[PDB]
């Protein structure tokens, strides 16, 4: 279906303990593939998937450069923003950035993005048209006026439309075995008891890739929400994802409540109800 | 493959 490549960077000042913490990660879809950590020994951009490890020396040096230079820009940016916002120097503060590019089932370019935040609130982001910026009032306006004048969007556009997409297309091929799979969920329903007069009914969905899934409950007709415990989709550890929604209901009415599981990689929507 | 060589600073 759709496909994305996103890089997430984070940077945290630490007045006392010298230079700040840096953590880059890169995703394709929802598979993590590279990471950098400043505090780690290697000071190398590190693979985190079997399909990128193929990549040569040209790649691994040049990615380590790009990321290092990026940490330095954040290092400065932390300083600049402590400025613009007038903050004390014993305070820890955070810069975050995420950029990346999506594509359709045809793998053609479909959109592009770049968004930036100081202390975990929206600072400045590049508009969908990739020509212009949107800035969160006070300080951001100064950043923008700088970025307008170095033609930063013109460079970004070239990355996001051209290069990002080429690389994304490379990754989807080179690692097709892992990125272009579907693992159907492994649905199952638990029956614990809230009481004598009630019965914790939980609808699982395990071992699935990709993470886009839909669980829904129904009481005879058309119930859909608010006896529906929808936990955030979470990772197992093994590259696949777990999710569940749960209903707790007047005991011996199990039968009239039904879970509805919808995944890419399901043939039809699977539907479960208390059985044994 | 990231944006490179480095972001424009703020």
């Amino acid at each position, epitope marked *: 279906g759709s496909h994305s490549m996103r890089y997430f960077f984070t940077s945290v000042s630490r007045p006392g303990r010298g230079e700040p913490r840096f953590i880059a990660v890169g995703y394709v879809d929802d598979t993590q593939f590279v990471r950098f950590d400043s505090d780690a020994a290697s000071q190398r951009m590190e693979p985190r998937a079997p399909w990128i490890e193929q990549e040569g020396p040209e790649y691994w*040096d*040049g990615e380590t450069r790009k990321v*290092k230079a990026h940490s330095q820009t954040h290092r400065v940016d932390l300083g600049t923003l402590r400025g613009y916002y007038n903050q004390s120097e014993a305070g820890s503060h955070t810069v975050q950035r995420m950029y990346g590019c999506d594509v359709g089932s045809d793998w053609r370019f479909l959109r592009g993005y770049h968004q930036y935040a100081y202390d975990g609130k929206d600072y400045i982001a590049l508009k969908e048209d990739l020509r212009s910026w949107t800035a969160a009032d006070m300080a951001a306006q100064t950043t923008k006026h700088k970025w307008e004048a*170095a033609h930063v969007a013109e460079q970004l556009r070239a990355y996001l439309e051209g290069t990002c997409v080429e690389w994304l297309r490379r990754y989807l091929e080179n690692g097709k075995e892992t990125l272009q799979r579907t693992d159907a969920p492994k649905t199952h329903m638990t029956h614990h008891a809230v009481s004598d007069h009630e019965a914790t009914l939980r609808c699982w969905a395990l071992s699935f890739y990709p993470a886009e899934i839909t669980l829904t409950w129904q009481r005879d007709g058309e119930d859909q929400t608010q006896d529906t415990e929808l936990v955030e989709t979470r990772p197992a550890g093994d590259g696949t994802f777990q999710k569940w929604a749960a209903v707790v209901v007047p005991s011996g009415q199990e039968q009239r409540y039904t879970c509805h599981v919808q995944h890419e990689g399901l043939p039809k929507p699977l539907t479960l109800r208390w059985e044994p | *493959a990231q944006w*490179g*060589p480095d972001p*424009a600073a703020a």
Partner: T-cell receptor, first 110, second 117 residues
Framework: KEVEQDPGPLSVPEGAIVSLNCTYSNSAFQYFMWYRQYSRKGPELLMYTYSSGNKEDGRFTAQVDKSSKYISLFIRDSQPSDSATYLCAMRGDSSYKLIFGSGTRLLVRP | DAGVIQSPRHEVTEMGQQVTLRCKPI?????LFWYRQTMMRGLELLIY????????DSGMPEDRFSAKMPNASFSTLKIQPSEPRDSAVYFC??????????????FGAGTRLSVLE
């Protein structure tokens, strides 16, 4: 990171048009430019060109054809002041480091 | 206003001897580049610093060469010992993001170094 370039000396008359060119082996490259270096001086940028497209600046035109992997500079109306070494630089995504050709020494005989 | 300044303009030295090359970049430029030029390999990068930390240093030879920016206004490139094959011109250069955008780097006139037998 290696780029072939005939070092001259290229000797042309005042009034001529000079073709300078490098060919290069790595296609990760993406920006292409020409620096000019006068005898005992630092090199200063002459002309740059984003990608396939040709930038023109009065008497200087500069080109990149990426399939052939061929960079070129065209000086019309040769002035003697154009006597200089001419060096094609170029780089990629990964670093600001310019990769330079050996250079071509242009000499225009007034 | 005056551009990149490099001391010395020429440095004739004997081999064995620590040569030390200096550069002060243009005020306001956070990128600083050490390039060498010989006749045999052409102009080449040695290293470049970005807000004083080294970024690309792939053209630094394996031993002998050292380079720092102890602050934003000065860099040494230090060869110890020298050898006759370090004879080269060694340029320094500085730039900004809005100028490296268009690949404008600004150069010094370089230290013609002859290391001798």
């Amino acid at each position: 990171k290696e780029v072939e370039q005939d070092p001259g000396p290229l000797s042309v008359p005042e009034g001529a048009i000079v073709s300078l060119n490098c060919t290069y082996s790595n296609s990760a490259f993406q920006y292409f430019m020409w620096y000019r270096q006068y005898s005992r001086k630092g090199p200063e940028l002459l002309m740059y060109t984003y990608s396939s497209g040709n930038k023109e600046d009065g008497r200087f035109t500069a080109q990149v054809d990426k399939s052939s992997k061929y960079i070129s500079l065209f000086i019309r109306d040769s002035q003697p002041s154009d006597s200089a070494t001419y060096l094609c630089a170029m780089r990629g995504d990964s670093s600001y480091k310019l990769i330079f050709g050996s250079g071509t020494r242009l000499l225009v005989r007034p | 206003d005056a551009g990149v300044i490099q001391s010395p303009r020429h440095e004739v030295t004997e081999m064995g001897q620590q040569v030390t090359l200096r550069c002060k970049p243009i005020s306001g430029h956070d990128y600083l580049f050490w390039y060498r030029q010989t006749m045999m390999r052409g102009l080449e990068l040695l290293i470049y610093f970005n807000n004083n930390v080294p970024i690309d240093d792939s053209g630094m030879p394996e031993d002998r060469f050292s380079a720092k920016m102890p602050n934003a206004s000065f860099s040494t490139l230090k060869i110890q010992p020298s050898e006759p094959r370090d004879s080269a011109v060694y340029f320094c250069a500085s730039s900004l993001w809005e100028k490296l955008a268009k690949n404008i780097q600004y150069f010094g006139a370089g230290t013609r170094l002859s290391v001798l037998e």
